[PDB]
Every structure is written in C-alpha cells, then in structure tokens.
Amino acid sequence: QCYAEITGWGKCLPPATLSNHDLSTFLDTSDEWIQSRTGIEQRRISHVNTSDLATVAAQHAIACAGVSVEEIDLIIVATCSPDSLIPNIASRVQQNLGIPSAAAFDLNAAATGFLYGLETATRLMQASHYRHALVIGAERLSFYLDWTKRDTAVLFGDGAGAVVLSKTEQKVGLQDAQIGCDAQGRDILAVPKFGTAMDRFDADNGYWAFDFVGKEIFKRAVRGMGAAAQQVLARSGLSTEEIDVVIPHQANIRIIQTLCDLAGIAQDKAFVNIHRYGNTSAATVPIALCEALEQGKIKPHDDLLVAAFGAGLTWGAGHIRWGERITPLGKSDAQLPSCDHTALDLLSKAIEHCKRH
Amino acid sequence: TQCYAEITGWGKCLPPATLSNHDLSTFLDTSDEWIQSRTGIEQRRISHVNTSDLATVAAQHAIACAGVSVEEIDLIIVATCSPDSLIPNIASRVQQNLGIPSAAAFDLNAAATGFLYGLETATRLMQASHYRHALVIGAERLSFYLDWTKRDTAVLFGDGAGAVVLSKTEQKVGLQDAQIGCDAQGRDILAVPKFGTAMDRFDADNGYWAFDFVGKEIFKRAVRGMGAAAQQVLARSGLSTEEIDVVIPHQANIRIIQTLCDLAGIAQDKAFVNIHRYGNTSAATVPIALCEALEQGKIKPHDDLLVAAFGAGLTWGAGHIRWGERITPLGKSDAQLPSCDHTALDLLSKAIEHCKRH
Ligand SMILES: CC(C)(COP(=O)(O)OP(=O)(O)OC[C@H]1O[C@@H](n2cnc3c(N)ncnc32)[C@H](O)[C@@H]1OP(=O)(O)O)[C@@H](O)C(=O)NCCC(=O)NCCS
Ligand SMILES: CCCCCCCC(=O)O
C-alpha cells in the first residue's frame, strides 16, 4: 500500500488586474453589487496562453518539491481553455520544462478538474509505476466571455495552480475521494457553440452564448459537494470537528458558507481568496492550497477537506492528510514575460467587437 | 485485495455517410489507385452528428454487450480531440443521454493514444478505489478540422467512436501492465496550433487554420515510442513475443504497424487492421478495432493481446490485455444514430466550397 504525498505546490497569477470599477466603465454594474453578491473585488486577465500560466505554476511547484524534471512520470493539466486541442497542452508544459518521457494528458471536468486530476494521479501512482506526478489546474477564461453580459462577465478570471506528488509508504496525501457529475445540471452552465459543434466558416461564430442559471447552479453545487464531502468524511471515520482546513472551489462565497453550515464545519476553517482572483475554474483549488500553505493555514499532519463543482455539473470532495513539511525546499525565479498592457487594454478588442455586434 | 478491470462490453458507432476515394477525386487531384496503393485506405466515414452522439451510440452497444445497468456505471471517460464543446465536457453529455446517475465524467485529450490513456486510467482507478464499473470511449469527428484543398491530409482521416465497459473482478484479466508516455520533442511535427484558446476569436478567417505535419519524423518517433513501450510491457509481463495472440494497433498508417511488428519480431498476421474501411479515427481507432476483432472471431478466450498507439504530442503507449472467458455479447442494442439525409459530399459541400474560395 502506497500513497501520493503532496510535496510541491505553486501558483501563477497573471499581473494585469481588472477591478469592479474597470467593469463598471463598460457594463451596467457596480463594485457595490458585485462585492456584496459575489465577494469578488478583482480578477486577473492573462496576456499569455493557458499553457504559459500552467508552465510557471509547475516550475514553482517543482522547486518547492526539490524534484528533478527527469523524475516526473506523469503530467495532468486540468483545463477547459486549452491553447490547442491538437496536440494537448500537457505536452506543451512537458516541452517547456524539458521533462523526458512522461505520460502527458489534458483533463476536462470544468472547475472540478483539479480534484479529478488529483484523484487520477493518486490512483495511478498507487496501482502502477509512477513515482512522481505533476497535476496542474490552468485557465484563460477571459477567452470565452461575452463582454455585453454582466451576469457572467464579472465572475471569471485567469490563473494556474500546481502540485507535485511523490510516492511514499507514509499515510499522507489524498485518502478517500468521491467525484461525480449531476448531468441534469448540464445545460445551466455552458458555452454550447465553442468546440466542434460550432460553424467553422460562419463569420459570426465568435459571438456565442454563455448559458448561466445562477440559482440552479447554487442548489446543485451545494447538493453535489455536500453529499460528496459526507461520503468522504463517513469513509474516513473522522468526526466533522477533526477537519482542520477546508479548501473549496472559489465560485461564490455564499456557496462555501452554505456547504460549511449544512456540514456543521466551522466557517473560519474555509480558505477564501475569491476576492482577489474571482473564479479561475480548475485553477481555484490549487491556487487556494498554495496560498493556504504560504499564509500558514495548514499545519503538519492536518486533515484537509477539498470540495469543488463545475460545468457538467461535475462535483467532488477529497480528504487530504498532510505530511511533515509545509515549507518549500527551494524557490523558483520563473516568471511570465513582462505585461505591457492594462487589463482594459488587453480586453479592448474583445469589448469593442462584442459591443459593435 | 488485488483486483482487475475486466473488459465485459465492447461497442462501436460508425456514421453511415461514406466518402470513397472516387468522391475525393471529384474535388482533389487524387485517384483511388494512388490512395489505396500508398495508404491502403478505400473509404472513411463522415459524421452528420456531433462527437457526443457517436460516443453515445458506441456506449449503448457496449452497455448491452456487458449486460450492465446504467445505474451501475461509476466512471465515464471520453477520449477525444474533437469535443462538441469545452464547457461543459462531452462525457457529461453521454451521461445525460444515457441517464447514468452520479458517475464521475471527464474528457481526456491525448490525441489517438487517448483511448489507451483512458483504459489505463480507468483500470487503476478501479484497482485503487471504489469504482465497480466504468465506461471508456474513444470518439472523434476529425472531418471538422480538415483543409479540403490539401490532398495530403484530406484523404487520411475519418469519424467514428468505439467503447468498452469495464467490470471489477478478482480474476487476473483485462489490462495487466501498461506504459504510456509522450515524446514532447515531436510536438511541433503534428499539430493544428490555431484551434483552441490560442486562436483569434473575432478574426473572420480564423476557420482557415494551418497544419504542422512532417510525415517521416512522425513515422520515426511513433515507431520508437510504441516499440519501446511494447517492449517494457512485454518484459514486465514475463511473456515471450510468440505468446502474444493478437495486436490491436492505432490505425494511422499500415507501414507503421508493419514496422512495429517486424522490429518486435511479432508475426505480421497477428495485427488487426481495419484502416481500409475507416481511415484514421484518432482515439476511436483502438476500440473500434477491438470491437471488430471480437465480432470477426480474432480474439479467443484467455488470449494475450498487445495494444499500441501514438498521437499528436507526440503521445505514445502500449498495453497488455489478458482476455477473460467471454467473447460474445450478452445482449444487443437497437441504438442507432438519427437518419442521415445527406451523402458524404453533401455533408462536406459547404466546407469544400469555403476552403476553395479562400
Ligand atoms: C509508409 C510511408 C512511406 C507512407 O507514405 P504516405 O504518407 O502513404 O505517402 P507519401 O507521403 O510517402 O507520398 C508519396 C508521394 O505521393 C504523393 N502524394 C501524396 N498525397 C497524394 C494524393 N492524395 N494523390 C496523389 N499523390 C499523392 C506525394 O507527392 C509523394 O511524392 P513526393 O515524395 O515527391 O512528395 C511512411 O514512411 C510515411 O512517410 N508516412 C507519413 C505519415 C505518417 O507516417 N504518419 C501519419 C499519421 S498522423
Ligand atoms: C487534422 C486533424 C487530424 C487529427 C490529428 C490527430 C490524429 C492522431 O493522433 O493520429
């Protein structure tokens, strides 16, 4: 019996920041409404592709773990916004990092993708011959947004988070997990016409709908994450009070609060950074984990509950038992190339096109 | 304690519209003579429906074949590089279509090696955790991507889907050892760089994307990648090469398949080939081939199978499957695609005209 210890953690947030005030200059919205309803103050807009965000996050996690790129056997990138479909962006991260041989694939389960990835990498390592793995959640959601619709335009940001996993006999890392999907919620969070269903030669194919029914997402997410968390906790044999930290998906603060309240988990145990970055889909959990560790929220031997949901409607929860070390072995100098533009400047073309159309 | 994931169901979905080599000759400077001689491809299928619809039908056939209830399916993996949509994933669409409650549902992209990646992943998930039954699907609508003015690539690819159902068991069956990987130095020799979030969303000409393709370099890297993976798998199995009963390869090029077998010392007649009927269907190739090998009586109970594949990445893989007792379906499915009211040329008419005009 082995386990997959989380030995490295890292993040990459692009520098360009879009404030609620910035959004109010081109949409009929306010910082007052957004902060009160969502809890989001700011979000980051990438000047580079998803794979570049993923690469920097991975470099930080590798340094943190002190592992050699020659030791990495498996690379999973969880994303719904890959640079390209052919080939996958896991292979681009592999190419960028100079990792020889590793299995490299992209996984799409929306914002639950990082937990899906962590479950998958963990079980691969437990049942087969993978010694070290790199699991990355990375998104450039700004690509997708309709800048005339305030409902969806204020919720999402770009970013990437990463972990490195190391095979061990110590009972650490992901213990039980339950992942799933409520396919009856499929049509309430969707971009139906980007992908091979779109008309390739229609000049207006860029003006797609972002389907979004917020109250239905709320209900299904709470139900989905809640029951998954219960299964995990029940299988662990832990009482609810033994959970030290909750690392949730960062989509909505009231969802996080409701999840904890219905579970009877203390509100102050949930790590929240949505105010800074908004919803970065698959990046939310690994960015949050990385920041929780940086800010001293996770102690050695802590019991963590991870929980997430996403378009699908995918859902999941996991129980992580932390090991001995909460400090990086090394630091990485890795950074994105310099950003010569403001967030409004980056979005200028897309805003003008959506408004004209 | 030690369990295994038996392949208990297999199924396929090939769309009805057939594009012949003659059809291709009416709008490209090519001939059936050249294509059949050079590639061995006679026909390929062009879908009138989205990838998820192909995936759904293949799954229905596999589920009937396995005699499993949709309530028993705990995991759905769709390997594809041509999904209907990115948000949400198409695994969830298959789940919605089939009425599967609760199952983990995700899309996996490792190009044509995706089915083997999927089979490895589902197997290990079942071995290390609480998944009793899984559905693993390779499904593609590659016709979406093609430049119909370029005969080089336009004659090689097709649409389709294949599926398996896996069932947890104590019997030493299903996927035994596997080795999967990626040669990222081959990343730039097979690619469609400008479809995805790297593309200009508001450029009216963003549909006319280029391909990176260096055929001799793909050949070399694919043979090297699959060959060494197959060796690792065989070496870990403790089997001699003569004990392999059937090879189920990726159907990209017949000389690649031949070279793989020759360098491994595997008899050429053990490799199952259906590229002549369907061309390269990326992640669907292996599961369609497996399904057809079973239908045609090529796989016996207790046979040792070698699966091998490669794809853009350059991803690569091999697997050793030990077959169990049953090679016949428990049930048949009536599931079919909706009627196709168009010929393959009619389906491709708009895309052909646009590519020619541009
Ligand atoms: C076995 C192998 C020789 C197969 O070759 P092939 O792709 O079937 O055919 P080739 O690319 O060698 O083409 C041979 C000639 O036919 C011509 N040709 C190509 N497509 C044609 C068409 N549709 N009609 C008529 N002639 C054509 C070419 O001009 C070429 O001549 P050239 O060498 O002077 O350019 C292999 O070594 C190879 O090169 N494969 C390339 C692709 C590959 O290996 N994998 C792709 C999977 S994604
Ligand atoms: C132009 C798109 C064709 C599909 C390329 C991937 C096929 C493979 O992996 O073998």
From Swiss-Prot, chain A:
- Do you know which Gene3D superfamilies this protein is assigned to? 3.40.47.10
> Where do the catalytic residues lie?
A111, H249, N279
Q: Name one GO cellular component term.
A: cytoplasm
Pathway(s) the chain acts in: Lipid metabolism; fatty acid biosynthesis
Catalytic activity reads: malonyl-[ACP] + acetyl-CoA + H(+) = 3-oxobutanoyl-[ACP] + CO2 + CoA
The Swiss-Prot or TrEMBL record annotates one GO molecular function as: 3-oxoacyl-[acyl-carrier-protein] synthase activity
Q: Which InterPro entries match?
A: ACP_syn_III_C (IPR013747), ACP_syn_III_N (IPR013751), FabH (IPR004655), Thiolase-like (IPR016039)
Gene name, please? Answer: fabH2
Q: Which organism is it from?
A: Vibrio cholerae serotype O1 (strain ATCC 39315 / El Tor Inaba N16961)
Q: What's this protein's family per the entry?
A: Belongs to the thiolase-like superfamily. FabH family.
Q: Name one GO biological process term.
A: fatty acid biosynthetic process
Please quote what the entry notes about the protein's domains.
The last Arg residue of the ACP-binding site is essential for the weak association between ACP/AcpP and FabH.
UniProt-annotated location(s) = Cytoplasm
In residue numbers, the region (ACP-binding) covers 250-254
Quaternary structure, from the entry: Homodimer.
Official protein name in the record: Beta-ketoacyl-[acyl-carrier-protein] synthase III 2
What this protein is reported to do is described as: Catalyzes the condensation reaction of fatty acid synthesis by the addition to an acyl acceptor of two carbons from malonyl-ACP. Catalyzes the first condensation reaction which initiates fatty acid synthesis and may therefore play a role in governing the total rate of fatty acid production. Possesses both acetoacetyl-ACP synthase and acetyl transacylase activities. Its substrate specificity determines the biosynthesis of branched-chain and/or straight-chain of fatty acids.
- Tell me which EC number(s) this protein carries: 2.3.1.180
**Which keywords accompany this UniProt record?**
Acyltransferase, Cytoplasm, Fatty acid biosynthesis, Fatty acid metabolism, Lipid biosynthesis, Lipid metabolism, Multifunctional enzyme, Transferase
Pfam families to which the protein is assigned, alphabetical: ACP_syn_III, ACP_syn_III_C
